Ligand binder design. Structure first.
Ligand SMILES: CO[C@]1(C(=O)O)C[C@H](O)[C@@H](NC(C)=O)[C@H]([C@H](O)[C@H](O)CO)O1
Length: 161
């Protein structure tokens, strides 16, 4: 089940495996693209942030994104996505988290990520062409968990390692 921790790297994870990310600091957590119709980066925002513009390096380039976190005590993982190379980034599906864990998976023509509020999370997805060959760059330590053991992954997202 819990295979890891692996150090930050760029690689091509197998389909139907959750990549469980364990960031320690605010900032970019993971990014991945098919270079055609899907770019996805996940940003971790600290608790209690009123609307402000921050700079992030996404896919090697500096980007300005306006972020907020309305929670007093919980972290906020935000997926920032664009659907063409020169498109603007939009924000989707936050996960408000106490344990600071997140996960992403390539499955059935989509990229899945976690969503909602710990300790009662759900999942959401994004349709992605050539989903199986998407390389991911992790900016923190990570673990690999098969989809068959999603119940274990969900437990860690909700309650921590
Ligand atoms: C086209 O419909 C879908 C999709 O991709 O299959 C449905 C999906 O539920 C939705 N996910 C979320 C989190 O909203 C997704 C995004 O809006 C879009 O991918 C962002 O680019 O759109």
């Amino acid at each position: 089940v819990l295979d890891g921790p692996y150090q930050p790297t760029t690689f091509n994870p197998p389909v139907d495996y959750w990549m469980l990310l364990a960031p320690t600091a605010a900032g970019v957590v993971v990014e991945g693209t098919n270079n055609t119709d899907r770019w996805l980066a996940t940003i971790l925002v600290e608790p209690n942030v009123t609307s402000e513009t921050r700079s992030y390096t996404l896919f090697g380039t500096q980007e300005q994104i306006t972020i907020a976190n309305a929670s007093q005590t919980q972290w906020k993982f935000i997926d920032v996505v664009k659907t063409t190379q020169n498109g603007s980034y939009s924000q989707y599906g936050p996960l408000q988290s106490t344990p600071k864990l997140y996960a992403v998976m390539k499955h059935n023509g989509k990229i899945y990520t976690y969503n909602g509020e710990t300790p009662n999370v759900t999942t959401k997805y994004y349709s992605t062409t050539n989903y199986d060959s998407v390389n991911m760059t992790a900016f923190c330590d990570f673990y690999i968990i098969p989809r068959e053991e999603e119940s274990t992954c969900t437990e860690y997202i909700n309650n921590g390692l």
